[PDB]
Structures are given as structure tokens and as C-alpha cells.
Design a protein around this motif. Structure first.
Motif, PDB file in Angstrom:
ATOM      1  N   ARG A   1      43.253  37.146  34.558  1.00 58.84           N
ATOM      2  CA  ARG A   1      44.179  36.643  35.560  1.00 58.84           C
ATOM      3  C   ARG A   1      44.031  37.439  36.850  1.00 58.84           C
ATOM      4  O   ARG A   1      43.877  38.662  36.824  1.00 58.84           O
ATOM      5  CB  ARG A   1      45.622  36.721  35.061  1.00 58.84           C
ATOM      6  N   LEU A   2      44.074  36.734  37.976  1.00 57.16           N
ATOM      7  CA  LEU A   2      43.938  37.382  39.268  1.00 57.16           C
ATOM      8  C   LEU A   2      45.158  38.256  39.556  1.00 57.16           C
ATOM      9  O   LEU A   2      46.252  37.993  39.051  1.00 57.16           O
ATOM     10  CB  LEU A   2      43.772  36.342  40.373  1.00 57.16           C
ATOM     11  N   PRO A   3      44.994  39.309  40.356  1.00 61.42           N
ATOM     12  CA  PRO A   3      46.140  40.156  40.701  1.00 61.42           C
ATOM     13  C   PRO A   3      47.193  39.386  41.485  1.00 61.42           C
ATOM     14  O   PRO A   3      46.934  38.327  42.061  1.00 61.42           O
ATOM     15  CB  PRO A   3      45.521  41.275  41.549  1.00 61.42           C
ATOM     16  N   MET A   4      48.406  39.943  41.498  1.00 66.53           N
ATOM     17  CA  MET A   4      49.527  39.272  42.147  1.00 66.53           C
ATOM     18  C   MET A   4      49.361  39.222  43.660  1.00 66.53           C
ATOM     19  O   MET A   4      49.855  38.289  44.304  1.00 66.53           O
ATOM     20  CB  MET A   4      50.834  39.971  41.779  1.00 66.53           C
ATOM     21  N   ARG A   5      48.678  40.207  44.245  1.00 66.45           N
ATOM     22  CA  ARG A   5      48.508  40.260  45.691  1.00 66.45           C
ATOM     23  C   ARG A   5      47.443  39.300  46.207  1.00 66.45           C
ATOM     24  O   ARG A   5      47.308  39.156  47.427  1.00 66.45           O
ATOM     25  CB  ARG A   5      48.165  41.687  46.128  1.00 66.45           C
TER      26      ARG A   5
ATOM     27  N   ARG B   1      50.770  38.498  30.824  1.00 69.37           N
ATOM     28  CA  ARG B   1      51.381  39.501  31.687  1.00 69.37           C
ATOM     29  C   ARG B   1      50.382  39.953  32.741  1.00 69.37           C
ATOM     30  O   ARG B   1      49.229  40.262  32.420  1.00 69.37           O
ATOM     31  CB  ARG B   1      51.869  40.703  30.873  1.00 69.37           C
ATOM     32  N   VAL B   2      50.829  39.995  33.995  1.00 67.76           N
ATOM     33  CA  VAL B   2      50.020  40.483  35.105  1.00 67.76           C
ATOM     34  C   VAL B   2      50.729  41.673  35.735  1.00 67.76           C
ATOM     35  O   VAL B   2      51.955  41.810  35.653  1.00 67.76           O
ATOM     36  CB  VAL B   2      49.743  39.382  36.155  1.00 67.76           C
ATOM     37  N   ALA B   3      49.944  42.547  36.360  1.00 64.27           N
ATOM     38  CA  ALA B   3      50.503  43.732  36.993  1.00 64.27           C
ATOM     39  C   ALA B   3      51.318  43.354  38.223  1.00 64.27           C
ATOM     40  O   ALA B   3      50.940  42.466  38.992  1.00 64.27           O
ATOM     41  CB  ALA B   3      49.387  44.703  37.377  1.00 64.27           C
ATOM     42  N   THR B   4      52.443  44.043  38.411  1.00 66.07           N
ATOM     43  CA  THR B   4      53.318  43.797  39.548  1.00 66.07           C
ATOM     44  C   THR B   4      53.270  44.980  40.505  1.00 66.07           C
ATOM     45  O   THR B   4      53.508  46.123  40.085  1.00 66.07           O
ATOM     46  CB  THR B   4      54.754  43.539  39.086  1.00 66.07           C
ATOM     47  N   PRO B   5      52.955  44.763  41.782  1.00 64.39           N
ATOM     48  CA  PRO B   5      52.918  45.881  42.720  1.00 64.39           C
ATOM     49  C   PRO B   5      54.322  46.324  43.083  1.00 64.39           C
ATOM     50  O   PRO B   5      55.254  45.503  43.134  1.00 64.39           O
ATOM     51  CB  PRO B   5      52.182  45.295  43.942  1.00 64.39           C
TER      52      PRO B   5
ATOM     53  N   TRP C   1      47.334  35.999  45.227  1.00 64.42           N
ATOM     54  CA  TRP C   1      47.766  34.635  44.949  1.00 64.42           C
ATOM     55  C   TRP C   1      47.884  33.785  46.209  1.00 64.42           C
ATOM     56  O   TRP C   1      47.747  32.560  46.126  1.00 64.42           O
ATOM     57  CB  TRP C   1      49.102  34.649  44.208  1.00 64.42           C
TER      58      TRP C   1
END
Ligand SMILES: [Mg+2]
Ligand SMILES: [Mg+2]
Ligand SMILES: [Mg+2]
Ligand SMILES: [Mg+2]
Ligand SMILES: [Mg+2]
Ligand SMILES: [Mg+2]
Ligand SMILES: [Mg+2]
Ligand SMILES: [Zn+2]
Ligand SMILES: [Zn+2]
Lengths: 190, 55, 292, 117, 49, 169, 77, 86
Positions: free
Chosen positions: B49-53, G15-19, B55
Motif C-alpha cells: 500500500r502506498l504511503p498516506m502522504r 494498516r498503513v503508517a500515519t504521519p 494519496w
RNA sequence: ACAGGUUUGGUCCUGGCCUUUCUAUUAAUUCUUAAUAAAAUUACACAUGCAAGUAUCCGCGCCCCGGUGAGAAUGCCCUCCAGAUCUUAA
């Protein structure tokens, strides 16, 4: 023990001279064991509360023998007069609770000059005593130290530009936090 | 190290040739390797899964 | 050109006035014992083994260097006000390297206030004992160096052991070293106990301190009572070396007296108990010239 | 043991006591365990204050600068100890953490002032 | 300017050799140029010369 | 020991008291001696006494003896550079061979001092670890630092259980 | 730790990492302090590399090594 | 055991008897007293000036038990046990 | 080993067994609280939970830590090192 303040007053008394005499307090004591070789560890404690554990130790069977660092005449009986080493517990026959106290009191009498022991001749620490080196002498202070400025220009907190603040606020949108100005110079106490 | 009773392991060396042939024969093409599910932000090839930043 | 302790002109007098007493220098200590060895020696081989023991007793009687009290280390390398209250304790950093002397080690301390200063003299030797320990030294100050334990050890006439303990514990240029070395010298002459340091490696220290303090009265009469005139004439000579400008040094120059009269010159010029010194000199004269 | 990669790193080996830590500043491989094999021990760090209230930190600078010039990586507490000793510049994390502590004090003083009235 | 301890190391190193020069020691920054994290790194095989 | 003619030469002290250390170039020592004649008595006593003392302190140097090959006793050193050092011994005594070999190819006292002075540097006093390599194991045992909780129990205000019990309320 | 052949957990699959939150006026000064610190530690690293170069070249072919490398052979001959 | 103990204790060689049979000074070298050459017995009579033959290698009848005890190969558990006093 | 018991109507010699010392597991009996250290039957089979993530995508790590002692008389120590990794122009 009637004295309770001076343990050496019992060692020079007549009740000690007619009971023990010129021999140590552990001369007549014989430890009972299972064979010809005794256990390397003596009795742990022979006085459990108010009951005495059968045949007591030389120090313990006579309650007027106070293990103290003042009476050197009692402490020299447990240190060899020739080699100066402290006798182990199976040697004399005292229980371990009193043997540990005897070693502690012998050390407390040795670091007080009351009991004699070997003092070797030790050469000085350094070969040459030179206080002219920069490690012990004063060093020329920095130009920033004589002025009062931090060692590095980036140590102090400089106010960042508003264009860079907005460039960061644009890229980090959604995850913003409250701004904080320059931190105080002196941190107050409670 | 070097012993007189060492055994001539041939299967371990055959499997190296088989895996080296498989690496180039079944080499995944970059088109499906870098594919992307724009709804779940999950790579269909690897499964990350791609990072949250991003998206 | 002031006379220093390392000069040969004073070491040649101090070595002569120390004296060679093999039965005192090579004395059985309280260490572990072992069965001795025996070998058949002739008269010349015995004299050779005796002179080997004398040349070993020289190294046994190697004198400890007496130095002046060092200057207190007060220097700040950096001051970081950013760390005024980030930590409660102070961080002590030590430069450890086998190839550098202990006088050149960097022993710094970052205080909790934020200053990076050099460690004091009481901390430098403590950390040097922590990271380079030597037998006979303690990390904390030993209780035996208190004045009551010192009084007990002086009443047990163990001044040689007090001195061999202080030289081992403290540095020769420290403050407590000079303090205890002077406090024991204030007692050995108060009680006239110069006989204890006769053939030890600490005779020259108290001689060089007594000549610096002009306290020679009892030290002269003890060498006179011990039938030792060659030691007293050289002691007065070393006093004349140390104090060149003085009536006692100039009267001997203007008179041209012998070693036997150099004692009378000092006993009449600058002697405190000159009557006692002259009575001891008369009692030595009238007791030596008749018997020998 | 034989590794596929890794790099030399100056770190702190937590070889000590329970409720009583004691770090050995050593230069070891990055793929080696914490208290495992090392190349050469540099210094030692005592986190707990002694009877004099000092945290004894010992650095062998002559080997530290040698291993650094040979290519040894450094960890965050090692750089913190070097910045507190003055062999290396002060870490930006120590600077920002001190600033944050000052801001926490500046918040607590105003809270304790507004609480009394 | 050098860090304090490292600067004092040179101030005490050059003093023992008889150098009376009280010049302030400086740290060079020419060969210490570093590219930012946005600079893309090459992907070609590095040739050992 | 008891078996043998001279049992003293089979002890660690006799093998350790022989001070003959060759240089790094010496590789082979061929001793050639005879078993008859009054001349080779010194070489026979050398092979009987000093050969083990040299071989103890030179474990990597090969030593080979040859008996009744040449009429004159001699030594032959084969170095790393290829040079062959021929030593003649016909009427020399046992000690003269030792001192001549230590004179021609040995290590001086100044050379032997620096090797042990560099070996001493390996064991550092400020290091910590096992008793085999270092002098101190648990920093607790330093007289000034915090004692070792296996010996002296820590106070209540310093334990992690009390800390996590204060952090709970 | 896990192994390359160990499958991930079911609760960690989606689950993905949260900054965390970012303070810009602190993040900017922290980045500039990071750059100003890393440039100095890089200069110090290069200086230490030069010290190691000097010590290695000295212990290989110095004015003290050549003296011994000549006098040893002189005394040997 | 008793007969051999008394025989060996009676066949001792005093230091004075050694100095008489060797016409040399018997010097005791104590360890804790340093290199101090303490003389215990003096060879009364004609003191010979000829030194004894210094043997480079002593041909002494050594014993393997004492050699083991000196080289530290005595790993027995009954040798260093703590026993009572005399 | 500072040794002791034990062969025979009895003595001496040779000679084996056992006792006395220290440590570890299990079992029995007993047992109050703390601190430290250690947790050890099984390479027999595993329900369930967790143990590799980080990141503006790429990438980098993923028996590295940790676990075990089955096999191998395997090995200890000593030369040469290909290759991998970190910083540099080398
Ligand atoms: Mg633990
Ligand atoms: Mg029978
Ligand atoms: Mg159980
Ligand atoms: Mg990834
Ligand atoms: Mg393992
Ligand atoms: Mg097999
Ligand atoms: Mg290689
Ligand atoms: Zn008792
Ligand atoms: Zn501990």
C-alpha cells in the motif's frame, strides 16, 4: 555484658585471664562434623533469636566478647601475626554471621590505624610533573566565548521566513500544528 | 572448510541454475509491475500500500 | 639560582645523612611468607651479595619528589545557555589513551547549568584512579587521613606508614599531600621522634622542610646525642647552602671554621635553644675525647 | 560470524545490571547483536549518578577519531555524548528538545499562575 | 570554528612542539558540500578505478 | 620428573629460562654433530641442554640434528632471504655456542622490551568485561558508583516497578 | 524477528503508517540545523580520514621506518 | 611411619654442620627481606677461599609430585581444602 | 588428600570397594517476606494471539536479532584472501 561501651575492658579483666589466659579464645574449641574433613562452609548463624545452636562458637559462647573495631586485642587473635591474613571460618570455628562481622570490623580497624598491616612503598603516579601542558593550564578563550555568542551560529533560534513557512504549510496541508515563537532564554522554575 | 570426506553437492548447484533461468524467463514486465489500484492505493503486483502522504 | 630538591649539591648531603641500615630497610613485612633459600658463599661472595643489597637499598631509598602546591584549575571551554536546565547531574568526560601521560589528559565536565569546564584537581585524580587504577589508591578519601586517626597513628609511632600511605594515596603537588606531610613533621619534632625516619626514604623530606622552616634545634641535638657529628656538620652546611644571606652563613665564611665549629657558629648565631645545643656539644666533647 | 552486509558502527552495548544500566561504548558490526562480538571497545557510560552526583562518561578519543576516519557510523546517543563532551557539535535533537522543555516550563508557569487566582 | 574540546586538542598539541603561534584554528568546508535529499542519485553501475 | 638422566631439563622453568629469541628471518637450524671424539663434546652438550630451550622460545623455527655425517661439528641457519649462515663449532663449550648464536642471530634486550611493551598495551585498565580479558565486570563494583543490586538492594524511589506504579495513578 | 517467508498479520494487513503532526516553524529550523550539523560532522570526518592517511603513510614509509629498515640490514651484514 | 619419621628427623643436617663440612658461609636469603644476605651459620675453623663449583645444570633427583605442584597441574579437590587449626 | 574404614587366629606387603569435600537436576518431608541470577525433558505434532517495517509512489531491510544442538569428530589456532557493506577522487 556490663561494659557495653568499652569492649577492651573485658579483655584485660581477670575473668578473661583465668578463663582463656595467653591462648586465643578459639584454642580449645573443636568443631564437630561428619568425617575427617570438615565442611568448607561453617555454621551460618548459631544464635537464632533466644536459642543457642547447641555447641556455640568461641566468640558466641561468651556474650562478653563484643565484635568491635576498638578492641584490637580481640581482633588480632583472628589475624595471623606473621602473614597478616585473616583466618577463614573453618580455621577458628566461628559461625559465618560472626566471621563476616569479624572481617568487617578488622577492615574498619585497619582503615583507622588501630590494627597494623602492610603498607608498601609505592612510586609516584607520574614520571614528570609538568603543569605547563594545556590540559591543566588555561587555554586561550574563543572569540565567540569572549563575546558571549554561541559556539555555532545555528545554535540560537532564528525566526524563519514567512515564505518558507507558507511553503511548508502548503506541502504539509492537513497535518498542521500550532506555531511557536522563539523559545524563552531563561526557563522558569516551579 | 577443506576436509577429505566432503560430499559433492550437485542439487544445490542445479537449483542455482534453475532459479537464475527463472529470474530472466519469468521476469515480471514493468507495466504490470508498477501497476496501481487508484481506489485502494495498493500495488497489484507486489501487494504493498502506498504511503498516506502520496494519496 | 635557588637550591632545588633535585640538585646533586643537596642530594649528596641528604643521601649521606640518611644512612644505610640494612636491618631497617630490608625488614620482614606482613606479606605472604615463603621458605627461604640457602647457598654456600665464600667471604668475597658474601661481600658481593652485601654490596648488591646496598645498591638495591639505594633504589629502596629513592627519595620522593617534594613539590609546591599546584594552582587550582579554573577554566571554561564553552558555555551553552541552551542546556541551563535540561539535566540535573553533570557529565564527566575523560580522555583515555595509554600513549598519553596523565598530566596531559583532557578531563572535562559539562555542568547542568550548561558550561563545559575543565575538571578540578580533586576530580581529575579521582577519575584518573577510576579509569587507570593503581594499588594503594582509593576512589574516595580514606578515613585514616582524618586528624584523630592521624593522632592515633602518631601515638602508635607509625609515621613511616603514614608517610608511605600518603605518598601512595595523594599526588606530591596536591594540597592534602603537603598538609599531611607537614602535619606529621609538626609532630615528629614536637615529640623528638626523628629516630623513626632515620634510615627510611623520608629523612630528606623532613630535613628539607625543617631547613625551610628554620626548625633545626631538636634535629641538631638528636644527631649530637646519636654520636653523629658528620650528619650535623652537613646539616648546618645544607642550612648555609639554603640561606646564603645570613649571619650564620657569613660568620663561618669570615672565620674559616671546621665542621666541628660550624655547629657552634649556628648554635650562637641563629639557634633558638642555643644553650641546649651548646650543652649537648660540651657533653659530646667531654664524653668522646676521654673515651676514644 | 559471516554476514552478507553491514557496516562498522560506534554504539552503546547495554551490558549492565537490572535497574542499573551501564553502557559499553564499542565499535561493532551493524549486523552483530547488542552485547555480542565487537571490534574494539572505546569507552564506558554510567547513566546513574555516583556519590558525587556525576555521570561518568569515558571516551577513547584517539581510537574514536581513528574509527570515524576509517568509516564508522554513529548512533544518536553516541552523537549525544560527543556533543555533550564537546568533541562533536551539539545535536539538533538536543537543541530542539531543550527548546521543547523550555516551552513546557513556560506553559506550566502560566498554568500555575492562572490556577492560584 | 572547531568544537571546543577538539579545538583545545589542537591548541595543546601544537603548544608542546614549541609553536608560539596563537592563530585561531579553523575547519575547512570546501570538500564538505552535500546535495539535498531531492537530488536524484544515479542508477548506473559504478566502475572501480 | 624422575625418569631420565637430567630430569631438570624437562620442566617449564628450565625451558623458560633460556633467553634465545631468533629474528623473523630465521627459518631452519640444522645442527650437525658427532657422537665421538673429545672435540664435539661442547656440541653434544649443546644438543643435550640448550636445544629444548631454543625450541621452546622458537616454536615456528625448524630444528634438525644430524649425527656422524661430517668430521667437524657445525650449525647451518637457513633464513627467509635465502642466506645460509654457517657456524663452525669444534672446541667451543656449551655456553659459548649459546652466546655466539645470540650474538650472530638473536634479539637484543631493547628489541625484546618493545614487543612485550606493545603486548601490554592490549589489556586496557579502563575497559570492562569478563575477568579473562578485563579487570572489572559490573561497573557497580567501582567504589564511587551505585552498588550492585545483587549485593545491595536499590532504594524504593529508583525501581521501575515503583516508577510504573506512580505512572499508573 | 520475522522471516521473509513469514506472512504478515491479519490485523496488520489493512494498516498503513500515519504521519504525525508537523510544526512548520519548528520543522524549518530543525531541517536547517540538521544541514548545518551534518556539514560540520562531514568536515570532521574528512579531517580524520586525512589523519589516518598521514599515520598510515608514516608507519609504512616514514623517516623513522627507513632508518630502521636500513640499519637492520647494516647490522645483519 | 613413626620409625621413618624419627629416622629422617634424626638424620638432619644442621646449618653449622653444613658450614663445617663445606668450609663456606651458609647465607640465608629471605624473600620478604629482599636481597639482604642474612648469615645463619659461620664455618668455624679454616674458611676456604675456593668457591664451590657453579654447576650450570643441577643434576638433582626431582619428584613429579613437586614438579606438578610447582607447574600448577595439581587440580585435586582435596589439596586446597579449608581445615581446622593445629 | 593430612587421609580414614574394610581381606586374616594374627602380622607385613600388594591390591580393589566405600567414607569424609564441592556443584547441578529429580523425588520425599518442611516452608514466612524481599532483592539478584537462572528457568534446562523432547530436531515428536500444533488450536489461537503477536513477533518487519519504514516512505510523497521507487527503493531499502524482511533466521539481521532471536531459537536449537539434530548431524558432523566434527574442530582449536595460524597464512592468503574472492565477494558483500560504509565514507571518499583514488
Ligand atoms: Mg538482565
Ligand atoms: Mg586373603
Ligand atoms: Mg521439583
Ligand atoms: Mg516497503
Ligand atoms: Mg545461538
Ligand atoms: Mg558419524
Ligand atoms: Mg577482501
Ligand atoms: Zn556462633
Ligand atoms: Zn551490577
Amino acid at each position: 555484658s556490663p561494659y557495653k561501651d568499652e569492649p577492651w575492658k573485658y579483655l584485660d579483666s581477670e575473668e578473661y585471664q583465668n578463663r582463656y589466659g595467653s591462648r586465643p579464645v578459639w584454642a580449645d574449641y573443636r568443631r564437630n562434623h561428619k568425617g575427617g574433613i570438615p565442611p568448607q562452609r561453617t555454621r551460618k548463624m548459631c544464635i537464632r533469636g533466644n536459642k543457642v545452636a547447641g555447641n556455640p562458637c568461641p566468640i558466641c559462647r561468651d556474650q562478653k566478647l563484643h565484635v568491635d573495631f576498638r578492641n584490637v586485642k580481640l581482633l588480632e587473635q583472628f589475624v595471623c601475626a606473621h602473614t597478616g591474613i585473616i583466618f577463614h571460618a573453618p580455621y577458628t570455628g566461628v559461625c559465618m554471621k560472626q566471621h563476616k562481622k569479624l572481617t568487617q570490623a578488622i577492615q574498619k580497624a585497619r582503615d583507622h590505624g588501630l590494627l597494623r598491616y602492610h603498607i608498601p612503598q609505592v612510586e609516584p603516579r607520574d614520571l614528570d610533573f609538568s603543569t605547563t601542558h594545556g590540559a591543566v593550564s588555561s587555554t586561550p578563550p574563543a572569540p565567540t566565548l569572549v563575546s558571549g555568542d554561541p559556539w555555532y551560529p545555528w545554535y540560537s533560534w532564528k525566526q524563519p521566513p514567512e515564505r518558507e513557512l507558507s511553503r511548508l504549510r502548503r506541502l504539509y496541508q492537513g497535518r498542521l500544528r500550532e506555531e511557536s515563537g522563539p523559545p524563552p532564554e531563561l526557563m522558569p522554575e516551579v | 572448510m577443506a576436509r577429505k570426506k566432503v560430499r559433492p553437492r550437485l542439487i544445490a548447484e542445479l537449483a542455482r541454475r534453475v532459479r537464475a533461468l527463472r529470474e530472466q524467463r519469468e521476469r515480471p514486465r514493468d507495466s504490470q509491475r508498477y501497476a496501481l489500484d487508484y481506489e485502494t492505493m495498493m500495488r497489484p503486483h507486489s501487494g504493498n500500500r502506498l504511503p498516506m502522504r502520496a494519496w | 639560582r635557588k637550591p632545588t630538591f633535585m640538585d646533586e649539591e643537596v642530594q649528596n648531603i641528604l643521601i649521606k645523612m640518611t644512612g644505610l641500615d640494612l636491618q631497617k630497610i630490608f625488614k620482614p613485612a606482613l606479606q605472604e611468607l615463603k621458605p627461604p633459600t640457602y647457598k654456600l658463599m665464600t667471604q668475597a661472595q658474601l661481600e658481593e651479595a652485601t654490596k648488591q643489597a646496598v645498591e638495591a637499598a639505594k633504589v629502596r631509598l629513592k627519595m620522593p619528589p617534594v613539590l609546591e602546591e599546584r594552582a587550582p584549575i579554573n577554566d571554561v571551554l564553552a558555555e551553552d545557555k541552551i542546556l541551563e536546565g535540561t539535566e540535573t547531574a553533570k557529565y564527566v568526560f575523560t580522555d583515555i589513551s595509554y600513549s598519553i601521560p596523565h598530566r596531559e589528559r583532557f578531563i572535562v565536565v559539562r555542568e547542568p547549568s550548561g558550561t563545559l569546564r575543565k575538571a578540578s584537581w580533586e576530580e581529575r585524580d579521582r577519575m584518573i584512579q577510576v579509569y587507570f587504577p593503581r594499588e594503594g589508591r582509593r576512589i574516595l578519601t580514606p578515613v585514616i587521613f582524618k586528624e584523630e586517626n592521624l593522632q592515633t597513628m602518631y601515638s602508635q609511632d607509625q609515621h613511616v606508614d603514614v608517610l608511605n600511605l600518603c605518598v601512595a594515596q595523594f599526588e606530591p603537588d596536591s594540597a592534602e599531600y603537603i598538609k599531611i606531610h607537614h602535619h606529621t613533621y609538626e609532630d615528629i619534632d614536637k615529640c623528638g621522634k626523628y629516630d623513626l625516619l632515620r634510615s627510611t626514604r623520608h629523612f630528606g623530606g623532613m630535613a628539607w622542610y625543617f631547613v625551610n622552616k628554620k626548625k633545626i634545634d631538636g634535629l641538631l641535638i638528636d644527631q649530637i646525642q646519636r654520636d653523629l657529628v658528620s650528619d650535623a656538620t652537613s646539616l648546618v652546611h645544607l642550612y648555609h647552602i639554603l640561606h646564603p644571606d645570613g649571619q650564620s652563613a657569613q660568620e663561618a665564611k669570615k672565620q674559616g671554621a671546621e665542621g666541628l665549629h660550624l655547629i657552634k657558629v649556628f648554635a650562637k648565631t641563629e639557634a633558638q635553644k642555643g644553650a641546649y645545643i651548646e650543652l649537648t656539644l660540651q657533653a659530646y666533647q667531654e664524653a668522646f675525647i676521654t673515651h676514644s | 560470524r559471516a554476514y552478507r552486509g553491514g557496516h562498522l558502527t560506534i554504539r552503546l552495548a547495554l551490558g549492565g545490571c537490572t535497574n542499573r544500566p551501564f553502557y559499553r561504548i564499542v565499535a561493532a558490526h551493524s549486523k552483530c547483536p547488542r552485547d555480542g562480538r565487537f571490534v574494539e571497545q572505546l569507552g564506558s557510560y554510567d547513566p546513574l549518578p555516583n556519590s558525587h552526583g556525576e555521570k561518568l562518561v569515558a571516551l577513547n578519543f584517539d581510537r574514536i577519531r581513528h574509527w570515524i576516519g576509517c568509516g564508522a557510523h554513529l548512533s544518536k546517543p553516541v552523537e549525544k555524548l560527543l556533543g555533550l563532551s564537546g568533541f562533536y557539535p551539539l545535536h539538533p535533537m538536543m537543541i530542539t528538545n531543550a527548546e521543547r522543555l523550555r516551552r513546557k516550563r513556560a506553559r506550566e508557569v502560566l498554568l500555575a499562575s492562572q490556577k492560584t487566582d | 570554528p572547531y568544537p571546543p574540546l577538539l579545538r583545545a586538542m589542537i591548541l595543546a598539541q601544537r603548544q608542546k612542539y614549541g609553536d608560539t603561534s596563537t592563530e585561531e584554528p579553523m575547519l575547512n568546508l570546501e570538500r564538505a558540500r552535500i546535495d539535498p535529499w531531492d537530488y536524484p542519485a544515479k542508477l548506473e553501475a559504478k566502475t572501480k578505478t | 620428573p624422575m625418569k631420565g638422566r637430567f630430569p631438570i631439563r624437562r620442566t617449564l622453568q628450565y625451558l623458560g629460562q633460556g633467553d634465545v629469541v631468533f629474528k623473523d628471518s630465521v627459518k631452519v637450524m640444522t645442527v650437525n654433530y658427532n657422537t665421538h671424539g673429545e672435540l664435539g663434546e661442547g656440541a653434544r652438550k649443546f644438543v643435550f641442554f640448550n636445544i629444548p630451550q631454543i625450541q621452546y622460545k622458537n616454536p615456528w623455527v625448524q630444528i634438525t640434528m644430524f649425527k656422524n655425517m661430517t668430521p667437524s661439528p657445525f650449525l647451518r641457519f637457513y633464513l627467509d632471504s635465502g642466506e645460509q649462515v654457517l657456524v663452525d663449532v669444534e672446541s667451543k663449550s656449551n655456553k659459548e655456542i649459546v652466546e655466539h648464536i645470540r650474538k650472530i642471530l638473536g634479539k637484543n634486550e631493547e628489541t625484546l622490551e618493545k614487543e612485550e611493551q606493545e603486548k601490554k598495551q592490549l589489556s586496557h585498565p579502563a575497559h570492562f568485561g569478563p575477568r579473562k580479558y578485563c579487570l572489572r565486570e559490573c561497573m557497580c563494583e567501582v567504589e564511587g558508583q551505585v552498588p550492585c543490586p545483587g549485593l545491595v538492594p536499590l532504594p524504593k524511589e529508583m525501581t521501575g516497578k515503583y516508577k510504573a506504579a506512580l505512572k499508573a495513578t | 524477528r520475522k522471516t521473509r517467508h513469514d506472512p504478515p498479520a491479519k490485523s496488520k494487513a489493512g494498516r498503513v503508517a500515519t504521519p504525525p503532526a508537523v510544526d512548520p516553524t519548528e520543522f524549518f529550523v530543525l531541517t536547517e540545523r540538521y544541514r548545518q550539523y551534518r556539514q560540520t560532522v562531514r568536515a570532521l570526518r574528512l579531517e580524520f580520514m586525512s589523519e589516518v592517511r598521514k599515520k598510515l603513510h608514516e608507519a609504512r614509509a616514514g623517516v623513522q621506518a627507513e632508518r630502521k629498515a636500513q640499519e637492520d640490514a647494516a647490522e645483519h651484514r | 611411619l613413626t620409625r621413618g619419621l624419627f629416622l629422617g628427623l634424626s638424620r638432619q643436617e644442621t646449618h653449622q654442620q653444613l658450614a663445617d663440612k663445606k668450609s663456606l658461609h651458609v647465607v640465608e636469603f629471605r624473600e620478604e627481606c629482599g636481597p639482604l644476605p642474612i648469615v645463619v651459620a659461620s664455618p668455624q675453623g679454616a674458611l676456604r677461599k675456593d668457591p664451590e663449583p657453579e654447576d650450570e645444570v643441577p643434576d638433582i633427583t626431582l619428584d613429579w609430585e613437586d614438579v606438578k605442584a610447582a607447574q600448577g597441574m595439581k587440580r585435586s579437590v582435596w589439596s586446597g581444602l579449608k581445615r581446622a587449626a593445629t
